[model samples]
Target: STGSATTTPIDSLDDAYITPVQIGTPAQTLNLDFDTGSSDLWVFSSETTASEVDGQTIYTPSKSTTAKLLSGATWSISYGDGSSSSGDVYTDTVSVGGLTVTGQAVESAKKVSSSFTEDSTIDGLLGLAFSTLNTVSPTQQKTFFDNAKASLDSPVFTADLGYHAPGTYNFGFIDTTAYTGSITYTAVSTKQGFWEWTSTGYAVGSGTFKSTSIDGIADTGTTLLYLPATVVSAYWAQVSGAKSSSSVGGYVFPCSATLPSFTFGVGSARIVIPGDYIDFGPISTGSSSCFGGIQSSAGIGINIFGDVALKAAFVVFNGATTPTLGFASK
Candidate 1:
């Protein structure tokens, strides 16, 4: 069945959005981050130690008649941001919006790192990446979307993300009214279990667009945009009083700097991000220094089209044969 749900951004962490999801027979509601960068449906649960879990809601499978333990199975995952979780496996009914998947594999966290524990508002992570990336030991598990795809009218999902504004995640259907202009699609490479795509070129502000192609991934879970060192350097050069701060480990500029817009080419389609979006707030509380939204991806290897970039456009993550990404202006 086609369904839709509102995704609200966290006030403290502008990077992620949370959606309400139900797990188990009677249903235990949890606010989960819809992460497309990795795969695995994991949640804080009774299995987690009370001391380690703070300000977060935990899912108790014993309270639900439908939840069953997956004997001898466990899962553990570490994210790029250093947040991690590990736990035993459970098979239960999981529902997102109105789409429900019976016998869905849900990882109940027994342990979580400080990064995750500190972010108490987020109850868990609902992975939207390919099921192949599921971390369950012995046999990999299918993601909630994967298990529900066959029953969907179309095997697709759309992410309408906004900056400090409410957005939505539509499943099995595309809402034409959510965006303006015609959607431009580009082939995606999923070999890496991510929606990785190559951009034909990029430009700083209204300057000439470069022709050099850069490979990167579309990661809703990521907070900021990351590109090559040379590309990041070029963009900062246009900002007066901008400098590469080793203390902060990225490019920082005066909060008053008139930042320039950034553009990236996808085949023949160009996604232009507004200048104001590039100024990622201040560096610290009451600090005048502001961090660049587009930073160097030197050691990170791949460029990430994070919230800073994705919020500028309406995106479609089509999981059907020859999976492709469709983009349109919001």
Candidate 2:
């Protein structure tokens, strides 16, 4: 079976994309972030301390007849802004769009970090990465995509993330019209349990396309694009007042500074990221200093092609035995 779900940007800067998900017997609907960088499905639940719940929606297993506690099973993960969470496990009926997984392992959070508790736009995270990366101890759990792939017409899914707009995620089948021209396919290295691939080349604005490759993972969970320090410095140099300031974390520039577009090669296709997409909005409310969407991967260790880059084109995650990735212009 095939299914589709609508994903909406959580904030003006597209900080995160949220999708409505149904879980348990009575079907408690909650808005969750579809994450490709992590492999555990966790939620803010009734099990969580009231003091830690804040204003976010909580998933109550008591309301669902199908919810069964997987006693002794526990999961802990660290994500977001150095935030972490630990939880209990429950197997319940889970549904996304039109797809259904009768017994999906759902992690019920008992503790969460301040960053997650403060984000009211998201109630939890639905992982889409390889199940091999699941943090569940003793018995690792499969992700929603992994469990649903076998029953699908095709073991594949596509991401059409948008900028300050609603986008769609298609499961089992590719929506040909969602992309333009043809898709450029590339081999993926799942050695590290990520959709890791190398780009053919890159160019700043309309400059010459160089033949330097950038190895990175296609992660929807990450909000910004991270590349080598050399590439980052080169792009920011083009902006009049761009500078890297520890006070601002990464690079920040005058809100009025001109930004040039960035282009990357996915095989023969050239996907262009508009300069405006690089302006990640003001560093603070009503402030004239703005943060850049692209940053250096020096501190991150691994470079990441996050939402900043993914939203620029159509992405396909092929879950077949050979596991490949496809990127196309939209």
Candidate 3:
């Protein structure tokens, strides 16, 4: 079987992508963030208090005829700020695009987090990472893709993200029309529960390609691209007015400055992201300083090849016994 659906940027900043999802018996439709970095299909639900309720939709399991409580099961996900959301668990019929997973684990958020309450573009999140990253206690549950992959014609999913345009998330098959040229395949290290891969090298604008190899995860959840400080510095130094902003954080440059393109290697294939994409728009309304789409992840342990880079190419998550990732120009 196969399923295909379009996902769009939730806001003008292209902060995140949102996909339509139906959960439970009556099928409550919600805009969910399909995150590839975490593995917990959680939702804003009837389990939480009214005081925490903001301007987002909530999933009421009681209203669904097929909703069943997963008793004794609980889950929690914390963040860098020590803030987190934890909740009770249930099983319900969940559907995304054209695929449905029966008895899908639906975690109901009982405690709220500040990041989610105020920034209400999505009702919840559907994790695309491996089930090993699932925060559920007592017993872990499989992701929607994990549960449905075996029955699929092929255990694969493709991410065709766009820039301020509609893109698709396709399951079970790779769309020939989605990209150009031949797809470049690379090995994935799933031991860490992420779609981690080693990128051969990178180049800034028309600069020479370095032979340095970088290890990072293909994280749809992250907003920007992050790499080693030395690598990122090479790019920033080329910009006439770019600097690491202490006030705004990360790298920033003059709004009027000309930006350079970014290129990353996937085996013999190179994906080039236009310079226009590197400029993440002005830091604030009426501000002259624009934030960069790429930043240094040196402070953090892991480098992230996030949505900023993902949207530059067609990506396939091949779920074979020894999983592999396929990249191609779009």
Top model number, TM-score: 2
lDDT of each candidate versus the true structure: 0.90, 0.91, 0.90
Residue-by-residue lDDT tens digits, candidate 2, 139-159 = 999999999989999999999
For residues 1-330, what per-residue lDDT tens digits would candidate 3 score against the true structure?
899988999888678899999998888998888888888998999987777769889999999999999999999997533457889999999888889999999999998888888767788888998999999999998999999899888999999999878799999999999999999999999998999999999999999998778999998888799999998999999999999987888999999899899999999789998888787888989899999999999767898988899999999999989999999998
CA-RMSD of model 1: 1.2
Candidate 2 residues lying further than 4 Å off, grouped into runs, are none
Residue 288: error of model 3 in Å?
0.2
- Could you tell which candidate, 2 or 3, scores higher by TM-score? 2
In candidate 2, the residue pairs with backbone N, CA or C atoms under 3 Å apart (3 or more residues apart, or in different chains) clash, namely none
Using Cα atoms with residue i matched to residue i, what is each candidate's TM-score against the true structure?
A: 0.97, 0.98, 0.98
Candidate 3 achieves a global lDDT of 0.90
RMSD of each: 1.2, 0.9, 1.1
- lDDT tens digits by residue: candidate 1, 85-171: 999999999988898899999899999999888888899999988888899998899998889899999999999888878799989
